[PDB]
Amino acid sequence: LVDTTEMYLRTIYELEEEGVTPLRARIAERLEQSGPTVSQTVARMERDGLVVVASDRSLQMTPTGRTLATAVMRKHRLAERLLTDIIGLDINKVHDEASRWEHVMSDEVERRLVKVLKDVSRSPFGNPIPGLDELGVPGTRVIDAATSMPRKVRIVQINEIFQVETDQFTQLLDADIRVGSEVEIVDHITLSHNGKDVELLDDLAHTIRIEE
Amino acid sequence: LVDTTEMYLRTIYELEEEGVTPLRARIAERLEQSGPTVSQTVARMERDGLVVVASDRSLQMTPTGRTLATAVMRKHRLAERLLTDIIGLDINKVHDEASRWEHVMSDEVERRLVKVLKDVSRSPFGNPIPGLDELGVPGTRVIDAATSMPRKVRIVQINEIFQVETDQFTQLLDADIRVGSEVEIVDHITLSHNGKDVELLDDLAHTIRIEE
């Protein structure tokens, strides 16, 4: 959990954020790791397809690397909000505490935070909290979201347009399940609504989007 | 932070707690680590003086090992309280989330929690939260607590009885500093009170106890 790649990606994100060119020496300095250690960490982050060292020797985050960096910063900043507004930790300690929490905070906890905190637009240090959008502030496909224990979620998309199988359209219509419909899900993928039970086919089990 | 020793000590604490004999196989099972891995982890926890394998091959925690185990469980359980009462995380996820947070939660955060939570006597799973006493629910000696930036703390003990140096007794008396006196501290160790400033001698800087 508490990992290096997450820490490096956040650092790149920050420098980028402060308008600084993400150069390896700048990163080594901030993270207080030797230049040889960063060179080798960057060397393997490059193999995971998270970063690429541009011609000018600056670190360009790949789309995947950037998405990960964004989740880390969102978690870090939501941690800061929780620590100051709710917990009341001394403002002088908040940042260093949030730097450890960012690696162990789950998506599920972030969603709850986003709901219990008064304001999640900025961290107490003035910077905006990124990626709130990924937190329903499209959606999880049921095959991934659906657990062995029912959980009422909301249908975001059906994607009938991508269905080669249309046999269950009326089944959903009779079931009264559409975009915005609070439904019960169990993982074949059975999704209940209005007392009518619908066992989704694989194609539908893969393209229907929901939000917790 | 997120470490093995902490995890093992907590496991021993739990088994002990549930009345189970802390045997290595029981621990390997619960932690889902092979028997050889636990043998070697226990083998080095024994060298750190945290655990001793009793004659019957059961693990007896040393006083130091037990104190550490207690802090880990207190943190873990205060995390559970925070996650259910404040955050509202699903009761089915609370334990596994708290198991990661226990390694990154600072003492300073625990004290704040103890203040912001309605009840810290038990975790939502029915077990008591241990070591609250270590959280002021005696004290930190100023030499360790005193930081470069003043912070009004409360004097818990003076320990005049252990002072070979008595030159500053009247200095404190004139300073009106005693057990219960809210004082300002800066780290020689200067502790202000009622506008009068007292630069403690080493012996006093080491034995005076305070609580944040």
Curated annotation (Swiss-Prot), chains A, B:
Residues 1-62 form the HTH dtxR-type domain. Its main location: cytoplasm. InterPro entries: DtxR/IdeR_SH3, DtxR_MntR_Metal-Reg, Fe_dep_repressor, Fe_dep_repressor_sf, FeoA_core_dom, HTH_DTXR, Iron_dep_repressor, Transcriptional_repressor_C. The keyword Oxidoreductase does not apply. Iron-binding repressor of the dipheteria toxin gene expression. May serve as a global regulator of gene expression. Represses ripA under iron excess. Homodimer. PROSITE patterns: HTH_DTXR. GO terms for biological process: negative regulation of DNA-templated transcription. The keyword Iron applies. GO terms for cellular component: cytoplasm. Disulfide bonds: none annotated. It is found in: Cytoplasm. Pfam families: DtxR, Fe_dep_repr_C, Fe_dep_repress. It comes from the Bacteria. GO terms for molecular function: DNA binding; DNA-binding transcription factor activity; protein dimerization activity; transition metal ion binding. Belongs to the DtxR/MntR family. This is Diphtheria toxin repressor. Transmembrane segments: none annotated. Keywords: Cytoplasm, DNA-binding, Iron, Repressor, Transcription, Transcription regulation.
